[PDB]
Amino acid sequence: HLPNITILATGGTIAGGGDSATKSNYTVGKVGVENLVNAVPQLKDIANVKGEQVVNIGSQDMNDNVWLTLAKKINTDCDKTDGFVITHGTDTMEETAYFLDLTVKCDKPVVMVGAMRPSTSMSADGPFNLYNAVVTAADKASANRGVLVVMNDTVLDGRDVTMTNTTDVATFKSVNYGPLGYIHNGKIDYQRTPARKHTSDTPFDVSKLNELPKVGIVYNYANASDLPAKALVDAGYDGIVSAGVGNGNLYKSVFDTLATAAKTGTAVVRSSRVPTGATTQDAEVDDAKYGFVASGTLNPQKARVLLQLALTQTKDPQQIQQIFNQY
Amino acid sequence: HLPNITILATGGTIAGGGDSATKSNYTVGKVGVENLVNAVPQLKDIANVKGEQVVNIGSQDMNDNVWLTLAKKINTDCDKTDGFVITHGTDTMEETAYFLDLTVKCDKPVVMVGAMRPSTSMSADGPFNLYNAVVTAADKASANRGVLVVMNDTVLDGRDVTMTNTTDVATFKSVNYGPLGYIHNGKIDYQRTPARKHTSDTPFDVSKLNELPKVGIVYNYANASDLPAKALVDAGYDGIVSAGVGNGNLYKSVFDTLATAAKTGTAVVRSSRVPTGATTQDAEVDDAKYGFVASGTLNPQKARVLLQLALTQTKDPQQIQQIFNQY
Amino acid sequence: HLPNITILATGGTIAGGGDSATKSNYTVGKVGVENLVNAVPQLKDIANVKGEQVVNIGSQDMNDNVWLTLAKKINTDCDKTDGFVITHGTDTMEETAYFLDLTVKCDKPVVMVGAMRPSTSMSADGPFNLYNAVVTAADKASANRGVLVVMNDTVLDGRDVTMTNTTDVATFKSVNYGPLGYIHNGKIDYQRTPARKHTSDTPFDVSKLNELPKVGIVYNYANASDLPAKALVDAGYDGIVSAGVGNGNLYKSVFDTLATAAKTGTAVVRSSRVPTGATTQDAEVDDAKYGFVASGTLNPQKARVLLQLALTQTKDPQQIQQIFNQY
Amino acid sequence: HLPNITILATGGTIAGGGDSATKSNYTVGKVGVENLVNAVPQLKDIANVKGEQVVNIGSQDMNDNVWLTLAKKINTDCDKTDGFVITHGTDTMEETAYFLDLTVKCDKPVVMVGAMRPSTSMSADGPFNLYNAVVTAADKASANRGVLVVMNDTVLDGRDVTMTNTTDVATFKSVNYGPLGYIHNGKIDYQRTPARKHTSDTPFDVSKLNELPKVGIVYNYANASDLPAKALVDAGYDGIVSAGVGNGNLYKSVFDTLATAAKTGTAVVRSSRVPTGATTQDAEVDDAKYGFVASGTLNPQKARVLLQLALTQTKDPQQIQQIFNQY
């Protein structure tokens, strides 16, 4: 009758609690996986669920080590289950989802979910999000779509999905290309699938890696200090992502530091602090002249994911641009 | 019998050009204020326009010296004109508009305007933008609303307005509280005004300042380096704004560096990389314990503006939090 | 000492139920106001609540009689309570809210609330919505803002608020002018108030009315039948609202019928089926010539509310247009 | 070595003019196809353009006869050109686009385009809109995606695309599933394609039809008259689409009239006035019990298109539901 679904838990508000149902204060990742699952008894109606705790952190402390652990656990356990759900904080779910989207080689459903309200709160969103994530992970139509995020009755691809609001339960949106499908009464009408290459159609293989190249992010604004970019350069960072103003534009002092870094081997990706649309070529910056790479619709944090992985294969800026055009 | 409107030009793509109407490439600041005005002769039908070129730069290079020049100029010439229009780049127009919103003591109309397509482009947006900006600055109903941005037939308050898309003509949106008015056929239906204190209702007086407090911005993401934050501390920054994940949260190592900076005198404001919603008190971070200030709906670059101005009066976190609750 | 808040219950999904927490099927009309109050014991911490069941219906069956009951009851009982919450279906909440916004003379807080998920749903939104609505009604800052809708942690004015999505908990938005305030941890930051005249600043007085003028709505689209329009004219309707295409345009057949209906004393308002933006004058329809009124930002169902009240005082198109310009 | 592109002109503002650059008044369908092409000399860099005038109307007067003309012309001429662009009014572009999406059996690019500003107006959108539409028609990657709409640098599928704002140049959005691609510097990065069946994958064949089944639309609101519904049933309409309240709900007297109509043969689809989201099954309305069909994400004007074409083939409500599940 029912699919075997593995829940890999990482913490987040979905496993987090406070002293009151009406007070906003909470602490993240106190609740273990077994307690989350038992708190939604209806999951037994749609899946045989096995829970495993990988870590128990707030996703604001998410890191490369947890990413390597998840990618390897999924790639190892692919043939032992029918699909995966990862419980995770909201704050960096959009980064973990895109990392997994590029490094998981299982094309069974892999679904991430979180909660914007603590499990102890009035009208807690976590129970029904988990229910719907398992509905998604259990649906054979979810296979081959890449890694997914299921939040607020919506299935979102891992590349485009991002947090649009600090607090709203409806915060996760695919702000450039839209969602893949909507969940109603336990059924999904998929109308889209991401054309960017994911999972088994990428060359990225972290099976034998215990660390990732070092990539930092710098912000642009009026009168922006070069000290952030200089500090990453002085530490020998492999790459730097610019959170540019407008269409990936650089403050004078930041342009100058990043131009000199790119000349000496630092991979430099222009992204934007602006929440939708592409950082394009052919605007005000001659990328080929400086050795810069344009991020396209990848926001800074998503550009960092792809750049880190691109640096596992190449330091050539032409080849990194080709990777930013395909993944 | 028409109003006297002064145009203060600072450059931007509105004044910019490329070598083809169809290709996207361009350079800012190729067109001076007199050519810009003369190219829109319909302005003569609604105002008597005088143009002064204040600077000629891309707004990616906007800085404190241009802010101080603009505030002092508008404050000095308030009694000589009926209204102001400031032509500016799009990329940091939301920063400049908020600075002027807090330091301009002239409650006559002050309206900022730019363009997403260069002046040479097919279907250039600059002309009708500039026209709508003068309509707005000529409308007696625009006075006392604080500094405004006029873009795509819409009147936006300087505090909430932000660039939502890298390339779209419709990019400027007041994403939290909505616009003030819509322009149709040179008439505005104003249904809103900003409740936060602006212009003559703020204590910020830059009339005798030649420099502003040093405030930098650090980005949060998975595995974030503390190095950028350490570099700003080590340089003696007066303040640091954090572009937090989710509801203004910080990666572990950034948290530890900013907690220590706040303890030892650095002003620290938690904002969010998330494009809409407040960074709130009473969530995961005990602000009162660390001496941190929560930015509310101010995005990192806007939080920087207010923190620079707060630091001209106080270094006390309870008093900076009061400022972030009123302006 | 906690404020006295009266809940006037009308039914809705918030008082709706189905057979299962996970199945989407539900019914309304079954569940009493004391059950909603019991789902939210935390109410006792913020107010002295008294519940009255006025009717128990799905708001898809909302009607003139319920509106008149509600306005008269709020106006009679104003000096007996400190604020009102109205529990109501989602589907026509934007119509009731605007009727009450025009007809209520009580300037104490009047807050409507519903739920997008039935009370029986996993992660039901009704409990926290109702809590936040009582917060809003208890907030002295909520007085003098007109009639409010509180949904998904957001305070929305009764004029601009509309249901944007069929199923999403985040459906309610003030799509043209934006919300008034956001609610976090039981506190509101109000940054806006509606400039259009409401409540005690309107001349609409239904205290002695037992019915309202008959006003119907016709839809425009390719090849539209004039029959719906001709049926309302033939039944001697007092007014017709057109849900126009684009900027309130009319299919040729519908134009002809409405042009005739206006000449024989039917009031005709052009609104739009487009969900945001004004139906303007000075576009493709000469309203003055035909005796039509342009709805501005009022959508068809909101235009019907103001037209019905306009017709309690005048049948003159110029006077109705002025009313559509002020309320 | 350029593609041959045929422009089929139907009228619209994009061919429309007013008495000034600066007043909003205009009349639609003045200029001819040859004047439109000559305004955009740049088209010669990207295509060999041939224009034909099919009609010269405001799209507010679009009708079944124009739709049958357009479908047959495209189907006959498919082998004579590399791609089609259709110039059209904005108001009903979303209807013609979906009709052609179901009935066109040419899988070469078919692209619709319009303009929200008059050709004579300052910063007219029409010229760069046509340029971009010809870019899209000439892109071999546009084939096999169904009939497209190109507006504001965006490629939108003919099923989801809708006019979201009355006046904004950015009005056209695919509000449920998002755009297919974005156009920058005359290039398109496609990242999506519609999964719903279109063009050569639909059984709809209009090649021999001179008429379409009669399908009318009724609007729901508080106190809705049943008289529009009764007028269509008395005229012996083949189908009726309900613009329902919320999730496709009906006012009681409309429900009763349409339940009776459905039992006696009339095909009834529940759609929604709400601008986004699906009208679902398994909510408050037992569709199978009344013989009703749920429209899904199809809005009322889009639901009419598909119900007209379904009625060319079947009047069985079960089979019509299957059609609403597949196209």
Ligand SMILES: N[C@@H](CC(=O)O)C(=O)O
């Ligand atoms: N800070 C928490 C927030 C939550 O999950 O809503 C996290 O990302 O783990």
Ligand SMILES: N[C@@H](CC(=O)O)C(=O)O
């Ligand atoms: N009424 C015009 C509107 C426009 O095209 O902007 C039309 O659809 O023909």
